[PDB]
């Protein structure tokens, strides 16, 4: 796919220059205080999201962005007739110049934005998005809980920290809970469609077995025990009754058609169990990644779908009772999941409110989900970057 491979900044904030060269899988940016980590994350997020109207609010000279396939974007801030103009020039030669004052007026009001998105959609600059995790995730989550959440939180955070700040679009825990409920509903409907298919399929399988001339009962017993004690079946979890009826009628009565029907029944049971496991594959993988971190609780679902936290006494609690660090762990593990949106994960200070035993495994459990996405983190903690010191990038800007 398309990944950021180089970012150059010239006279940004009229203060410094900085050229960063990236990897395609993991980048651990680190540096001293005021080295420009957060501004680098903002530049990357604004370029990748295609939100070039943010660059009217940044004082700079030239910003060059190189992707993996060779696409290059050059953004310049020129001064003519005591007016600043932002010029975006691609590698294709197609360019767009817009005035700073018009962009500022449209921002304060919220035509030019339509031209910008026409230019972006013409050249496919929004092929891959970026999930932006700010350094102020906790108070923003607490404020917004008291894409519309993205819009309101982006407006509030841009009011607080300036208008260059990108659109906050990381998955909030409420969004995580809602999308988990939707995926559980979709998995239940897929199981229903599979049962409706396999009913008519197993009928002609039985009819094929009836026209041709021991441990199977134990295997059917094991499959029925596994399926009856499965949380994914909220309806008709009584295969033990029909298994007992089948074994009682067998022990009361050898036809080869009975053995063929037992083979068909065992195959139907194991195939329904296999489809039931593969329908809940993403949800179980995500909750297994989360539950490898949580100590005295366990994120789980139960049957209307219920998604919450089981405690060792068996009581349930919502996700809202979680800590700040545990909620941040949930969001950062969801952004790297396969059910999360495929993007470029940009996290600013991922070590916030995380114990060092979680910092040492955060990047490992994010890269072990085989998402294939590019992760760029900016950290102050040596425990985030442990085990992955080959991917550490140290930024030392040249101050002027």
């Amino acid at each position: 796919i398309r990944t950021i491979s180089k970012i150059e900044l010239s006279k940004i904030h009229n203060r410094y220059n900085l050229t960063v060269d990236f990897f395609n899988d993991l980048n651990v940016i680190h540096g001293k205080n005021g080295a420009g980590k957060s501004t680098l994350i903002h530049v990357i997020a604004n370029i990748v999201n295609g939100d070039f109207i943010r660059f009217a609010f940044l004082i700079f000279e030239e910003i060059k962005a190189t992707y993996s396939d060779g696409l290059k974007i050059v953004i310049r801030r020129d001064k003519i007739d005591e007016q600043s103009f932002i010029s975006v020039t691609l590698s294709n030669g197609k360019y767009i110049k817009f005035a700073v004052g018009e962009a500022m007026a449209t921002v304060r009001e919220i035509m030019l934005a339509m031209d910008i998105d026409k230019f972006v959609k013409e050249n496919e600059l929004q092929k891959v998005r970026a999930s932006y995790f700010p350094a102020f995730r906790t108070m923003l989550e607490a404020w917004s809980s008291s894409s519309f959440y993205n819009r309101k939180a982006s407006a509030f955070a841009r009011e607080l920290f300036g208008q260059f700040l990108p659109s906050i679009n990381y998955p909030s825990p409420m969004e995580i809970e809602d999308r988990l409920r939707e995926e559980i509903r979709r998995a239940q409907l897929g199981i229903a469609a599979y049962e409706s298919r396999t009913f008519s399929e197993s009928f002609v399988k039985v009819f094929s077995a009836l026209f041709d001339n021991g441990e199977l009962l134990k295997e059917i017993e094991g499959l029925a025990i596994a399926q009856d004690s499965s949380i994914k079946n909220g309806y008709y979890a009584e295969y033990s009754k029909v298994y007992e009826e089948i074994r009682s009628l067998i022990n009361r009565n050898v036809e080869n058609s009975v053995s063929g029907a037992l083979v068909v029944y065992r195959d139907a049971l194991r195939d329904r169990q296999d489809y039931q496991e593969k329908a809940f594959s993403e949800i179980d993988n995500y909750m297994s990644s989360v539950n490898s971190f949580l100590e005295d609780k366990e994120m789980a679902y139960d049957f209307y779908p219920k998604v919450g936290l089981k405690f060792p006494d068996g009581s349930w609690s919502p996700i809202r009772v979680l800590s700040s660090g545990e909620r941040q762990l949930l969001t950062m593990l969801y952004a790297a999941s396969k059910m999360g949106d495929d993007a470029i994960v940009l996290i600013d200070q991922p070590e916030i409110s995380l114990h060092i035993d979680w910092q040492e495994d955060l990047l490992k459990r994010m890269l072990s989900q085989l998402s294939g996405r590019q992760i760029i983190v900016c950290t102050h903690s040596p425990s985030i970057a442990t085990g992955y010191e080959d991917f550490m990038i140290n930024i030392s800007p040249e101050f002027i």
Partner: protein, 305 residues
Amino acid sequence: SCAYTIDSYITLLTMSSKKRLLVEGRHDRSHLYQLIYKFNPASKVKIDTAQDIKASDKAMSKNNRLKIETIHSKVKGKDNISFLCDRAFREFAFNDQIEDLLNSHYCDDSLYWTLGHSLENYFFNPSIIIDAFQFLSPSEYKYKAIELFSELISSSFAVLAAVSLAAKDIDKAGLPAALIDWKDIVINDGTIKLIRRDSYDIDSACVDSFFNAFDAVLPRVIASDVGICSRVVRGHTGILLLQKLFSACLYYVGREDDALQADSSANYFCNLSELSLTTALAESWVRKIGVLEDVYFPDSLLKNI
């Protein structure tokens, strides 16, 4: 840089509840991760590297062993951490014959030493070297080269140990890595003889001193036991020396069919990255544990954690 100091890491040991292991380099971390994950693929042991711990002292800055000894001394008695270092040439006797005074893994309050010179000496079992070189080969004349190599590997360890001892006598440990080239090696009837090449980029004084030390140390190495001999070879030196010895034997036995093809294959093998060789040897070493009684591993260290 963004790394812990000695005191910060000690505080991390106080705060962290994981089972930990401290090793010198990142390559030792990767090899030990494969070793641990073979016995327990779901193991939760965290392996730290002393290479990624800052030291205020200039001398202690690049001395990984001194960092490990300092940390071990200051937390001597903790239960959740174990330490592993490289034995180097410690506890070895050079009284005209190579003698191992331990013949087992050293242990001193969760501080352990490798059985050989370093961790890579575990790869020096002949079956592991064979399997690894066979898997990572140009795949042109592999079978005959492996057949010749299995004959040469028995006596070649004396040569490798003599090279390492000659390097440590003049304190130029990294000298044979760039000095000796695969073309200088000659394949005899089970032996090898690294001819003193007339042309070398380095000054003749160093080359002459190296061969004087090699000649003065070779009969002593010959009289020693082969098994003890295979453990004193320097870890970094041995990998490259085996790479050249295999490039030489491959070209020696493959030149008659096609000299150019054999030379290209030999140069391709000689240009292989050290990391590729070590990873292939590590995978072979992991697979051979428990199948052959002649493959060793830090059993005490694994048992302790």
